[PDB]
Paper text:
EccC, the motor subunit of T7SS, is essential to assemble a stable membrane complex for the secretion process. It contains a two-pass transmembrane domain, an unknown function domain (DUF), and three Fts-SpoIIIE-like [name] domains (ATPase1, ATPase2, and ATPase3). In our structures, ATP and a magnesium ion bind to the nucleotide-binding site in a similar manner.
[name]-ATPase3 crystallized with two molecules in the asymmetric unit. The overall structure adopts a classic RecA-like ɑ/β fold, with a central five-stranded (β7-β3-β6-β5-β4) parallel β-sheet, which is further extended by an additional anti-parallel sheet that includes β2-β1-β9-β8. The adenosine ring of ATP is clamped in place by Arg327, Pro558, and Tyr576 and surrounded by Thr384, Ile385, Gln573, Ala574 and Pro575. The side chain of the conserved Lys382 in the Walker A motif points to the region between the β- and γ-phosphates implying that it may play an important role in ATP hydrolysis. The β- and γ-phosphates and Thr383, together with three water molecules are ligands for the Mg2+, and they form a regular octahedron around this ion. Instead, they mediate stability indirectly through interacting with water molecules coordinated to the metal ion. MtEccCb1-ATPase3 has a unique short bulge loop 423LGAGA427 near β4, instead of a β-strand observed in other solved MtEccC-ATPase3 structures.
Numbering used by the authors: 318 to 578
């Protein structure tokens, strides 16, 4: 009678990521980010952010959204120096002060806790990021190689998308950045967005989260009520905190996302 071992209800980031490679490594190694422990083998699943730049995290109340975003930002910072990565945060509920060490923050206005701050920061970011757009001049050998510009990748770490949408009036938030999203891989842009499950369905059809979702961004479906998001592809159901059905074009599987105090 074989011994039972199930997906543990709490896995620390150091258990998921005991041997992180460092800034010394190449781009591919620096952006192979562990995001959780698979139920099938207690082995890390990864965000291949060197190829698909984004990650979406959907979840009901107290399902672990903020902590997971914290933990994944840490795994990214373990792999990348402040010359290789910079973080801009949307943190309306003010829970991500320590998600990133102040060495890796994108300037003095990196942490935005309200609409006025975020609008200004997103304006400045889009102006800077558009400078990295690929010319039609160059050769496709330079396209995947991203050789026409050098600098840090930008991670847009966005907690509680539903609040940003609600506090934006009727205007779309991230309007300056949404047009650049098709070129995210070419300009080194990564968005990591959490959203309450009750609004995540509406979010999958907007121009920011929906652009990443419709283009195959890996998506954690944490605990939620099936009727908030009933599409049978994803198995939206009540889950322990941190447990998620991870969906990408690369497959669908149950993971335990990392915890961090
Ligand atoms: N990866 C995880 N694994 C297990 N438990 C977790 C994990 N992350 C968070 N938790 C637990 O779940 C609780 C809620 O965590 P957290 O605030 O991150 O979720 P949330 O979705 O941001 O909640 P809120 O609805 O307040 O925004 C915490 O008390 C924490 O102990
Ligand atoms: Mg939260």
């Amino acid at each position: 009678a074989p011994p039972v071992r199930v997906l543990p209800e709490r896995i620390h980031l150091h258990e998921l990521d005991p041997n992180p490679p460092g800034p010394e490594s190449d781009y591919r190694t620096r952006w192979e980010i562990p995001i959780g422990l698979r139920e099938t083998d207690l082995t890390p699943a990864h965000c291949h952010m060197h190829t698909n730049p984004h990650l979406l995290i959907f979840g009901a109340a107290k399902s672990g959204k903020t902590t997971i975003a914290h933990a994944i930002a840490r795994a990214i910072c373990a792999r990348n120096s402040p010359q290789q990565v910079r973080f801009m945060l949307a943190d309306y509920r003010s829970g991500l002060l320590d998600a990133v060490p102040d060495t890796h923050l994108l300037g003095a206005g990196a942490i935005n806790r309200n609409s006025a701050s975020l609008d200004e920061a997103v304006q400045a970011l889009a102006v800077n990021l558009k400078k990295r757009l690929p010319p039609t001049d160059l050769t496709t050998a330079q396209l995947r190689s991203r050789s026409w510009w050098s600098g840090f990748d930008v991670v847009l770490l966005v907690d509680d998308w539903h609040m940003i949408v609600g506090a934006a009036g009727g205007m779309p938030p991230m309007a300056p950045l949404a047009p650049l999203l098709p070129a995210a891989a070419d300009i080194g842009l990564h968005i990591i967005v959490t959203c309450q499950m009750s609004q995540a369905y509406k979010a999958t059809m907007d121009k920011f989260v929906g652009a990443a979702f419709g283009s195959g961004a890996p998506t954690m479906f944490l605990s939620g009520e099936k009727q908030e998001f009933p599409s049978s592809e994803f198995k939206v159901k009540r889950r322990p905190p941190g447990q998620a059905f991870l969906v990408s074009p690369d497959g669908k599987e149950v993971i335990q996302a990392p915890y961090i105090e």
